[PDB]
């Protein structure tokens, strides 16, 4: 509501002048012109309406109308022109301020403190800005000035009507407060139910996602239906509450079209009463009612524009605070500068992350750096040398340390600009621009050449070309890139690729090295200079760096990661942190640091050295007969009895200028209006409600089919990539709500529209055929051939989608490269390439789009005037009477207006019809693995031993049909004896389980009691197993139901019993709602041990004839570990249970009766190698069991 935001803004006092401040003084009054070019056009209707009654008095009495027509059309023309001016003004102003705020935002982005660069990652900002623009590019345009026109019209109409007659309109305007009251009272009761409706939807969302993620656990226990039931029981409440909301939503709508007619009737009635009591004519009564009515219409169209304007205001306040965010590390020029940089001293460098405020990395980084020295440094792959170079560059500052230089001055006194100026940097990867080869090289010295002109006298702009192509030649010859660049065509012309994508990487690193060399730093630094080079080119680069022109004044720090290239070094401060801070463990030269001791550096140098589909829907819709016929009848009644108002209004005008027999006529004609209103109420009520009552059922019978078919689909369908839970949950919600909102909201509208367009047109021919043909021709050539709004919105939206669309995107991925140089060189390379291409097309676009809007506001006036002229023309020569014309006219006009009114309620029809074909196969797609298909032998769960056998297997996934996984497996497990499996970790041990449970089918042969697997009625085959994953999963149901998952019929006492083996049934008796406390989503409200014990209890409740473990106690404490192992051995002691395990401790393997082993000689599969160690013969020959006892 507007009052909400008004009370909000009342206290902070945002300036309503705020968007209009990035403007010169010239645009202060080009704006002001449009103030007066949009108040005059509000004083138009008070003239038309004030002559409206006089025209009718003048036509049905004999006299002529010609002066008033010419008095009117001139005002129409000046309205056209005054409407044409304002568009051209306002759009230009908006484009200007829109450009300028963007160009301020880019600058403010380039002045973040380094920490903020890490806080908000990159392209998010690029995705934010544009969004805010489309909240303000189309929210302060012409639809701001449309306020004042309507306000002026309101004031003029009401006050003129009041001075002409006051008691009448006072007696009329006493019904509209009751509309506002009903509106708020209905809005309350709508929100109160809508929020509960929303509340009962996220539950279903969770039930879908959490169930699709952990899919195979559902298939193993066969717990499909106990999710469907919860889904339906949560869906029904949503349906009923949203229908209760739609009822009140439709009642108010159907009501507002009922009181306006009472207003008309009482108005005319009291008018005739005062006319009779007079002894003020009748021409002064037709206008008062229309004035008071269209006056209070403008208060329904002003407010959305105010909302959008406040929205633009808050959007701009959400951006100027970004532009007014100050960094801590400023690139000012207030800092001083030494003659040259001497003796950069470090001492106790301390710093923590501003995000994580309890983690330190450095303690005592401290050493000296003075000109004329050579060095060599190396760090581990987790040091944070990035932090070191960032602090050299001053992206951050320490917390306790110091950057003392020359033992007299800290870095804070030194100019950051001068500091980065005299530092050549090279980084890890070649992520460079796409301008050209040389332009990455000659633009560097700008960072210094600005100083030639900034402190001297803009001469900076002209000295760009002054740096010629001289140094590229020699700096290319040095790094040996001269050979290649002089070989391929377009030597210094073929640009470095799009975001550095065309040429080789190491050669782009040579370009970076040339940048560092050419910019003439007093301190030339390199970091990861030679990270991934070959031998000879690296050595030549080394020879280039250590012996540049005049190496007596420089500090040639180098950080390589190959240890055969740290040969020369005045000192090698290699460090370690073994964790609250590093410290330099190693100190010395290359020769006196490897042979020093058997230390860390010693180890380092040692190691390296079609239409059917939709008539499905229509078939579904053509079965609920009790709700189709009612909608049909309401459509008939509305379409039939709205036009009757027109020719009941005409007869009431023609009978007004007859002083005789007036009382009876009034008493007879007002009552029909009353009755028609009482019918229209009920019609619009029962029309806008069963629409949604039919919309609901199609959704909640399609969602059922989808979510019921998806569960039974085989596992290979889920193994694919596109079959992701996110997209599959996105479909079921979005496209189904579109099938509701899109389709049935565009089958009723067409029917009602066609009903009106037939009945009104036909019984408009019958009274005056000569006028109707003209009118239809006019509106035909106007709408379907000169669609002003269509062409306007098209020409808008095409060019509103939008080389400023190319440089901006690639200028953020290289945000670390722009800091090497280039801060304003691309502040002033986008202004040009914007302004050059805006205006040249903008002129034509805006002049056309302003003329087309100025035409649209003053078209009905000319048509109406022409109609009145053509009507009073024929009547003079005695061809048609007056009443027939009035009847043929009012019906057409009012019905056209109403038909255009309700037409603007459609929804998205095409995209829903499109998506229905996307997801139609899924509710019908064949899976060829169905738990329901029960053709096969039943597994009676009493005659079972558990003898598994493997004849031969050669299996491979379809995800890659190139990697063999099994090379002729063969082993057995006889009866009620453990068979442990010890092998290489990651060799694919936990895959045979999936084969056994028919998650995949067969290039291999598995037997159960010497019987094939495909003849078992697999529901029962999954009824006598129980697995244990690495981590179980706990759904959002109760602990009672989590344990009872799979088997619905079970007592709480049995749960208390089987919960004893897991030894967890004491913690549960430590809090209220013991077997009722609902765990959180994904089991995030409990521990890991509790989770596994609950999973074990769930597996044991079923009385599983065969057990299948996997990674028993990978992370549990010894207590729960030995309790579990106690359960294992105790349950092995009894018969009637064959167990198979995959352990990682001899503590359990000692009880193994046969220990089968898998090996991986070469990466092409596995096969059995060992059998029968049974803890006695650990290695009579070679094996891995010896390894897994001597390591254990
Ligand atoms: O049919 C009515 C209508 C009124 C007026 C008014 F009298 F205010 F100048 N002008 C309309 C115009 C006009 F072009 F502005 F004259 C076009 C279509 C409908 C108009 C309104 C339009 C908005 C939806 C309700 N009917």
From Swiss-Prot:
Residues in coiled coil: none
Binding-site positions, Mg(2+) 2: 990, 1030
Binding site for Mg(2+) 1: 428
Topological category with respect to the lipid bilayer: Multi-pass membrane protein
EC annotation from Swiss-Prot or TrEMBL: 7.6.2.2
UniProt main location, coarse: membrane
Topological domains, Vacuolar: 56-64, 164-165, 271-282, 649-668, 876-879
Keyword line: ATP-binding, Hydrolase, Magnesium, Membrane, Metal-binding, Nucleotide-binding, Translocase, Transmembrane, Transmembrane helix, Transport, Vacuole
Binding site for ATP 1: 353, 355-356, 381, 383-387, 428, 1086-1087, 1089-1090
Result of changing residue 195 to Q: Significantly increases ATPase activity
CDD domains in the record: ABC_6TM_Pgp_ABCB1_D1_like (cd18577), ABC_6TM_Pgp_ABCB1_D2_like (cd18578), ABC_MTABC3_MDL1_MDL2 (cd03249)
All copies of domain ABC transmembrane type-1, residue ranges: 32-311, 630-905
GO terms for cellular component: food vacuole; membrane; vacuolar membrane
PROSITE patterns: ABC_TM1F, ABC_TRANSPORTER_1, ABC_TRANSPORTER_2
GO MF annotations in UniProt: ABC-type transporter activity; ATP binding; ATP hydrolysis activity; ATPase-coupled transmembrane transporter activity; metal ion binding
Domain ABC transporter as annotated: residue spans: 344-578, 948-1190
InterPro entries: AAA+_ATPase, ABC1_TM_dom, ABC1_TM_sf, ABC_transporter-like_ATP-bd, ABC_transporter-like_CS, P-loop_NTPase, Type_1_exporter
Family: Belongs to the ABC transporter superfamily. ABCB family. Multidrug resistance exporter (TC 3.A.1.201) subfamily.
Role played: Energy-dependent efflux pump responsible for decreased drug accumulation in multidrug-resistant cells. Transports lumefantrine, mefloquine, chloroquine, quinine, quinidine, amodiaquine, piperaquine, dihydroartemisinin and quinacrine.
Any further remark recorded for this protein: Can transport human ABCB1 substrates rhodamine B and vinblastine. Does not transport amantadine.
Protein's UniProt name: Multidrug resistance protein 1
Organism of derivation: Plasmodium falciparum (isolate 3D7)
């Amino acid at each position: 509501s507007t009052a909400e935001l008004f009370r909000k803004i009342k206290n902070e006092k945002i300036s309503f002048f705020l968007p209009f401040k990035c403007l010169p003084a010239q645009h202060r009054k080009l704006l002001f012109i449009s103030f007066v070019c949009a108040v005059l056009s509000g004083g138009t209707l008070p003239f038309f309406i004030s002559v409206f009654g006089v025209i009718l008095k003048n036509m049905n009495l004999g006299d002529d109308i010609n002066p008033i027509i010419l008095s009117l059309v001139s005002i129409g023309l000046v309205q056209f022109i005054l409407s044409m001016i304002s568009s051209y003004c306002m759009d230009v102003i908006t484009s200007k301020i829109l450009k300028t705020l963007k160009l301020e935002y880019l600058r403010s982005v380039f002045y973040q403190d380094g920490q903020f660069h890490d806080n908000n990652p990159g392209s998010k900002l690029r995705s934010d800005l544009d969004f805010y623009l489309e909240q303000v590019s189309s929210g302060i345009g012409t639809k701001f000035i449309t306020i004042f026109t309507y306000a002026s019209s309101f004031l003029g109409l009401y006050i003129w009507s009041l001075i002409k007659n006051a008691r009448l309109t006072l007696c009329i305007t006493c019904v509209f407060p009751l509309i506002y009251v009903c509106g708020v009272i209905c809005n309350k009761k709508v929100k109160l139910n809508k929020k509960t409706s929303l509340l009962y939807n996220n539950n279903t969302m969770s039930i879908i996602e959490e169930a699709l993620m952990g899919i195979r656990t559902v298939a193993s226990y066969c717990g499909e239906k106990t999710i469907l039931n919860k889904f339906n029981l949560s869906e029904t409440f949503y349906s009923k509450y949203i229908l209760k909301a739609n009822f009140v939503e439709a009642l108010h709508i159907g009501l507002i079209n009922g009181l306006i007619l009472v207003s008309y009737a009482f108005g005319f009635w009291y008018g005739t009463r005062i006319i009779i009591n007079s002894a003020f004519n009748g021409a002064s009564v037709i206008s008062i009612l229309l004035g008071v009515l269209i006056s209070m219409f403008m208060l329904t169209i002003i407010l959305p524009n105010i909302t959008e304007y406040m929205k633009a205001l808050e959007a701009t306040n959400s951006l100027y605070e970004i532009i007014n965010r100050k960094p801590l590390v400023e690139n000012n020029d207030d800092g001083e500068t030494l003659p040259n940089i001497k003796k950069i001293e470090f001492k106790n460098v301390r710093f923590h992350y501003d995000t994580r405020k309890d983690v330190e990395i450095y303690k005592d980084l401290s050493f000296t750096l003075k000109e004329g020295k050579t060095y060599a440094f190396v760090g581990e792959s987790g040091c944070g040398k990035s932090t070191i170079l960032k602090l050299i560059e001053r992206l951050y500052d320490p917390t306790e340390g110091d950057i003392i230089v020359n033992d007299s001055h800290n870095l804070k006194d030194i100019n950051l600009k001068w500091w980065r100026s005299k530092i050549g940097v090279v980084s890890q990867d070649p992520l460079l621009f796409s301008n050209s080869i040389k332009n990455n090289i000659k633009y560097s010295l700008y960072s210094l050449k600005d100083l030639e002109a900034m402190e001297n006298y803009l001469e900076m702009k002209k000295e760009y070309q002054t740096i010629k192509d001289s140094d590229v030649v020699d700096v290319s010859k040095k790094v040996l890139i001269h050979d290649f660049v002089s070989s391929l065509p377009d030597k210094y012309d073929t640009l470095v690729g799009s975001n550095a994508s065309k040429l080789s990487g190491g050669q782009k690193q040579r370009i970076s090295i040339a940048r560092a060399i050419m910019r003439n730093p007093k301190i030339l630094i390199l970091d990861e200079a030679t990270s991934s080079l070959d031998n000879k080119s690296e050595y030549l680069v080394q020879k280039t760096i250590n012996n540049l022109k005049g190496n007596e004044n420089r500090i040639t720090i180098i950080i390589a990661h190959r240890l055969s290239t740290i040969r020369y070094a005045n000192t090698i401060f290699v460090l370690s942190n073994r964790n609250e801070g590093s410290y330099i463990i190693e100190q010395g030269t290359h020769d006196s640091l490897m042979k020093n001791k058997n230390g860390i550096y010693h180890l380092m140098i040692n190691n390296q050295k079609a239409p059917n589909n939709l008539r499905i829907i229509y078939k579904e819709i053509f079965s609920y007969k009790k709700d189709v016929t009612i909608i049909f009848f309401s459509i008939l009644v509305a379409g039939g009895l709205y036009p009757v108002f027109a020719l009941l209004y005409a007869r009431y005008v023609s009978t007004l200028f007859d002083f005789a027999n007036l009382e009876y006529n009034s008493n007879k004609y007002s009552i029909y209006i009353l009755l028609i209103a009482i019918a229209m109420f009920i019609s619009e009520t029962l029309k806008n409600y069963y629409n949604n009552k039919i919309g609901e059922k199609v959704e909640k019978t399609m969602k059922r089919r989808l979510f019921e078919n998806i569960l039974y689909q085989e596992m290979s369908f889920f193994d694919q990539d596109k079959n992701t839970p996110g997209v599959l949950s996105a479909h079921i919600n979005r496209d189904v709500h579109l099938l509701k909102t899109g389709l049935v909201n565009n089958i009723v509208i067409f029917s009602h529209f066609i009903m009106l367009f037939l009945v009104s047109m036909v019984m408009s021919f019958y009274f005056c055929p000569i006028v109707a043909a003209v009118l239809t021709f006019i509106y035909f050539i106007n709408m379907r051939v000169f669609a002003v709004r269509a062409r306007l919105t098209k020409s808008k939206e095409i060019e509103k989608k939008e080389d400023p669309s190319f440089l901006i995107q690639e200028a953020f991925y290289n945000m670390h490269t722009v800091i090497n140089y280039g801060l304003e060189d691309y502040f002033c390379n986008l202004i040009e390439k914007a302004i050059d291409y805006k205006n040249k097309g903008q002129k034509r676009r805006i002049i056309v789009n302003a003329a087309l809007w100025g035409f649209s506001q003053s078209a009905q006036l000319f048509i109406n005037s022409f109609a009145y002229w053509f009507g009073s023309f024929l009547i003079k020569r005695g061809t048609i009477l007056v009443d027939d014309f009035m009847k043929s006219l009012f019906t057409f006009i009012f019905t056209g207006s109403y038909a255009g009114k309700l037409m603007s309620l459609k929804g998205d029809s095409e995209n829903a019809k499109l998506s229905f074909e996307k997801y139609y196969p899924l509710m019908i797609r064949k899976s060829n693995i169905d738990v329901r298909d029960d053709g096969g032998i039943r597994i009676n769960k009493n005659l079972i031993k558990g003898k598994v056998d493997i004849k031969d297997v050669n299996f491979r996934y379809i995800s890659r049909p190139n990697v063999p996984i099994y090379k002729n497996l063969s082993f057995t497990c006889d009866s009620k004896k453990t068979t442990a499996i010890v092998g290489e970790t990651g060799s694919g041990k936990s895959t045979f389980m999936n084969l056994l449970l028919r998650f995949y089918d067969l290039n291999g042969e598995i037997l159960l009691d010497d019987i094939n697997i495909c003849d078992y009625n697999l529901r029962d085959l999954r009824n006598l197993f129980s697995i244990v994953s690495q981590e179980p999963m706990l759904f959002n149901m109760s602990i009672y139901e989590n344990i009872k998952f799979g088997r619905e019929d079970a007592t709480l006492e049995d749960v208390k019993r089987v919960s004893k083996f897991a030894a967890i049934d004491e913690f549960i008796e430590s809090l209220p709602n013991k077997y009722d406390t609902n765990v959180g989503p994904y089991g995030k409200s409990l521990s890991g041990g509790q989770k596994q014990r609950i999973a074990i209890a769930r597996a044991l409740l079923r009385e599983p004839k065969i057990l299948l473990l996997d990674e028993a106690t990978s992370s549990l404490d010894s207590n729960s570990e030995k309790l579990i192992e106690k359960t294992i051995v105790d349950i092995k002691d009894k018969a009637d249970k064959t167990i198979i395990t995959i352990a990682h401790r001899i503590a359990s393997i000692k009880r193994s009766d046969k220990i089968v082993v898998f090996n991986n000689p070469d990466r092409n599969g596995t096969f059995v190698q060992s059998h029968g160690t049974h803890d006695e013969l650990l290695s009579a020959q070679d094996g891995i069991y010896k390894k897994y006892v001597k390591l254990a």
